[PDB]
């Protein structure tokens, strides 16, 4: 927050920004160790510097601002004279914008730079201006009459022919157009053009729209995001200008209570309650048909219904086939009443201050009620990745909400039968009103007036939706994507792989993406697209030599779901299966990555039902190849059914997929068997959960 922003230009005329870095105090020195890690001292020559910011005095008085270099030119408030010495009458707590400019060929490299020193004198007392009185500019305040990177300077005349030249920062977001178009990085408020060696050191390559101050369409500018100057409750992956700050509030059920009495405050009547699990993505994956074969490199799957993490499915547990109505004795035409234990969540990147969600409780298409939770009853604010009630505490009962304090949610006799038939209660959050956080004064977050409504729509119109589903947590993102048909759309082009990396802060290991310890490469996950996204990806895959979905360009409107497997092995470092695959030979480098299972005969895994969830649809996937023979691989899965299929591998790796289903907890082991013939290679065997099934 404190200090001034230094703009260091390679040229003499403040045009070619080499380094943007904050200085501490009037000494105008930056953090040299951090700049060193980003600058090559043989390529660090600068010929003009500008420092900008705000002076806030701690005492009214007549301040004389000066610099040890007569060369330097200063201005205060864009209103004072432009001079090496300024006499300003300042008031306590008032803000005085300051612009210090130095032009000097033979200024030297950034390392050897003897920067000027900024002093001020009050009552004849001359001192270096302390850090506590120097503040950076409000870079969220885009002032057309005071641009962050002006196209003119205090030293050079505004030439007539110099008209019609390009702006340095066309959208006035404080990132030069050359930076945005070609790539930059910001770490510790230090900004520089991108170099590919920065990736090895862990710096993130930022690109953004040089014509859009808010490329993602969210409340924060490209610089606010890239620099991390926004609300610290925003997830760090939203620092990327192409990853929107975007709250995604939903609610899931973990207990369903059905009573014959409508009154929440009544201990009379018959009541049946059952624990429930919930899924933020089941409505998405339940509409996925699984093919055994994949063609033309398209190793992903299509869902008929791309639902977001706001549409939550409910699975009733420990039912034992006992109908809901046996414990209620409700008759045809009568109604029982629903109470539930619910938990709100935020799978997005931004907090929802004053969270006011609207959720439809849906059963087989029927809206049983519309829950209108008030912020005062759900923790006021819901931060990304958090829940209300908080993760460790008991879930919120609907009856304690003001809406249901007097009466519960009625449910019909016929709707009770649908519940027995296996129809799942959906909690579909349709809209969430709320506010975002902007800083104020000493760095405090201010929320009121900052409605999310218009930004939510704006973000959605220029973005792709990417959902990452792990067992523990689901993450939904909005990544800005270009309209490839719009010739004037200056949104940076991302591959799907680059977008996934940015959206989730994924790391890389041997070029493949990792989400913490989970591999999320396309060969280690179940990618799920809607029909329109899948058709675009299939067409793009036909234009690539290296046919990888992650190399396909991201287009706006795309809907992408990454379902990480429950169990996975790459036959290398990773094998979290709960049983041992038999007859495994990994003494080779013939895998899709690293080693493969060189299958000489039969490989078998026996998985107890203690290691799988009951009444779920699973897909067993993997990659196979056979370089010198076309030997059929026999695949046999023994679950709720016993099915056998004959698989033909090619010389290169191809994907196979087989769906299977679990039943009760007391079921026999799930057995998966693959039989090869000597030169069969297997890799990246996964078991992924898809959806619940009726009981």
């Amino acid at each position: 927050n404190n200090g001034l922003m230094g703009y260091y230009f390679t040229d003499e005329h403040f045009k070619d920004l080499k380094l943007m870095a904050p200085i501490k105090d009037g000494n105008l020195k930056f953090e040299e160790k951090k700049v060193d890690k980003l600058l090559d001292k043989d390529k660090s020559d600068v010929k003009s510097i500008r420092w900008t910011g705000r002076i806030i005095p701690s005492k009214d008085g007549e301040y004389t601002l000066s610099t040890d270099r007569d060369d330097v030119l200063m201005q205060v408030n864009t209103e004072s004279t432009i001079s090496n010495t300024l006499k300003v009458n300042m008031k306590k707590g008032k803000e005085y914008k300051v612009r210090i400019e130095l032009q000097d060929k033979n200024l030297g490299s950034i390392d050897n730079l003897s920067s000027p020193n900024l002093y001020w004198e009050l009552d004849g007392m001359k001192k270096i201006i302390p850090e506590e009185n120097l503040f950076l500019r409000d870079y969220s305040n885009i002032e057309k009459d005071d641009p962050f990177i002006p196209n003119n300077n205090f030293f050079d005349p505004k030439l007539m022919s110099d008209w019609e030249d390009e702006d340095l920062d066309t959208d006035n977001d404080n990132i030069p157009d050359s930076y945005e178009r070609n790539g930059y990085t910001i770490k510790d408020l230090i900004a520089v053009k991108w170099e590919d060696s920065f990736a090895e050191q862990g710096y993130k390559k930022y690109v953004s729209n040089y014509l859009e101050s808010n490329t993602a369409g969210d409340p924060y500018t490209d610089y606010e995001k890239a620099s991390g100057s926004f609300d610290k409750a925003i997830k760090t992956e939203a620092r990327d200008p192409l990853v929107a700050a975007y709250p995604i509030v939903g609610v899931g059920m973990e207990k369903l209570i059905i009573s014959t009495n409508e009154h929440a405050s009544t201990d009379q009547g018959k009541t049946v309650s059952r624990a429930t699990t919930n899924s933020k993505t089941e409505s998405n994956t339940a509409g996925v048909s699984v093919n055994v074969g994949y063609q033309n490199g398209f190793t992903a799957n299509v869902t008929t219904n791309y639902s977001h993490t706001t549409d939550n499915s409910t699975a009733v547990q420990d039912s034992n086939g006992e109908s809901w109505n046996t414990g209620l004795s409700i008759n045809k035409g009568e109604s029982a009443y629903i109470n539930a234990n619910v938990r709100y969540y935020n799978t997005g990147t931004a907090p929802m201050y004053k969270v006011t969600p609207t959720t439809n409780l849906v059963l087989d298409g029927d809206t049983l009620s519309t829950i209108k939770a008030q912020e005062n009853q759900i923790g006021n604010n819901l931060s990304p990745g958090d829940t209300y009630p908080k993760k460790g505490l008991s879930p919120l009962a609907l009856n304690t909400m003001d809406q249901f304090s007097s009466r519960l949610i009625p449910i019909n006799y016929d709707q009770l039968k649908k519940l027995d038939a296996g129809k799942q209660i959906k909690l579909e959050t349709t809209q969430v009103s709320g506010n975002f956080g902007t800083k104020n004064s000493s760095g405090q977050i201010v929320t009121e007036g900052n409605s999310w409504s218009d930004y939510i729509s704006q973000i959605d119109s220029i973005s792709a939706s990417i959902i990452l589903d792990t067992e523990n947590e689901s993450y939904e993102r909005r990544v800005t994507a270009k309209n490839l048909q719009d010739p004037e759309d200056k949104t940076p082009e991302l591959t799907i792989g680059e977008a996934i990396e940015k959206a989730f802060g994924a790391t890389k290991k041997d070029g493949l993406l990792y989400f913490n310890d989970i591999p999320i490469d396309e060969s280690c996950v179940e990618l799920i697209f809607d029909d329109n996204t899948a058709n675009k990806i299939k067409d793009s895959l036909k234009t690539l030599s290296d046919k990888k979905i992650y190399n396909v360009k991201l287009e706006r409107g795309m809907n992408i779901l990454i379902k990480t497997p429950t169990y996975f092995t790459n036959f290398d470092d990773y094998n979290n299966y709960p049983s041992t695959w038999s007859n495994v030979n990994t003494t080779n480098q013939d895998g899709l990555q690293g080693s493969a299972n060189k299958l000489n005969g039969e490989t078998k895994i026996k998985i107890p039902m203690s290691e799988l969830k009951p009444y779920k649809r699973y897909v067993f996937s993997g990659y196979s190849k056979d370089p010198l023979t076309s030997n059929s691989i026999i695949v046999k899965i023994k679950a709720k059914e016993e099915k056998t299929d004959y698989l033909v591998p090619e010389q290169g790796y191809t994907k196979f997929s087989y769906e299977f289903e679990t039943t009760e907890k007391d079921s026999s082991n799930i057995e998966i068997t693959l039989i090869g013939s000597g030169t069969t290679y297997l890799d990246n065997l996964s078991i992924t959960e898809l959806n619940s099934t009726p009981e």
């Epitope: 913490n516 049983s579 290691e611």
Partner: antibody, heavy 118, light 108 residues
Framework: QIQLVQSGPELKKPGETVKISCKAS????????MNWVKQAPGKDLKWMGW????????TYADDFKGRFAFSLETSASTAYLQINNLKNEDMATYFC???????????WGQGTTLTVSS | DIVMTQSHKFMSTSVGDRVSITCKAS??????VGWYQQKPGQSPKLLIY???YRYTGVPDRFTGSGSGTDFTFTISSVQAEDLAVYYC?????????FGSGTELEIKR
Amino acid sequence: QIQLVQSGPELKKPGETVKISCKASGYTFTNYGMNWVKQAPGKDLKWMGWMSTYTGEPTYADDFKGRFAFSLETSASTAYLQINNLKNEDMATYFCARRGNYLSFDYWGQGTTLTVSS
Amino acid sequence: DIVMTQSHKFMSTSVGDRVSITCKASQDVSTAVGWYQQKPGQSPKLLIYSASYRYTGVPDRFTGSGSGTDFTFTISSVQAEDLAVYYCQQHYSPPFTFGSGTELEIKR
């Protein structure tokens, strides 16, 4: 990096109940199970069973069916081992150990000694 | 239950000597054998996994060999910090039996 941190040493009377906790960090808790291992003063390392952090279902070794209960707090990345109706034979050091890659016990807790005495 | 029978309860050695511990599995465990080191009062530490794969950060004086039922753990040059108990363990199928352990001791 990956750390398994167990609760401190326990002193219990015979017939009492004790609950050992095992907090995991540095890895996705629900992607790997949790083994529990007993080491009696003079005996070898004995596998007590494991807890699936994916299903929440425990599996118990034959010698530990009855008085032993594994439980889960996924929101705290914590596994628990409860022993009811304590006997002197329960005096041992108890370890949690990740059901790691290829079912190897690749990360171990520091151990929890349990002293049973009247 | 797959039983892991280890070579010697006690093994006397000198610092800088070579020692090998064998372990016989009661049935085929392919390569699913681990070797653990335990110093007094500490938890076991995985040294070798999958019979031969050195674990992260493990010195290269520790090596593992074998497949099927016969397995060897070797310290090419014993260091004073290696005086501890070493267990073989099958991590093939429960109950993941541990060997009875081999204590390294200084010969005199």
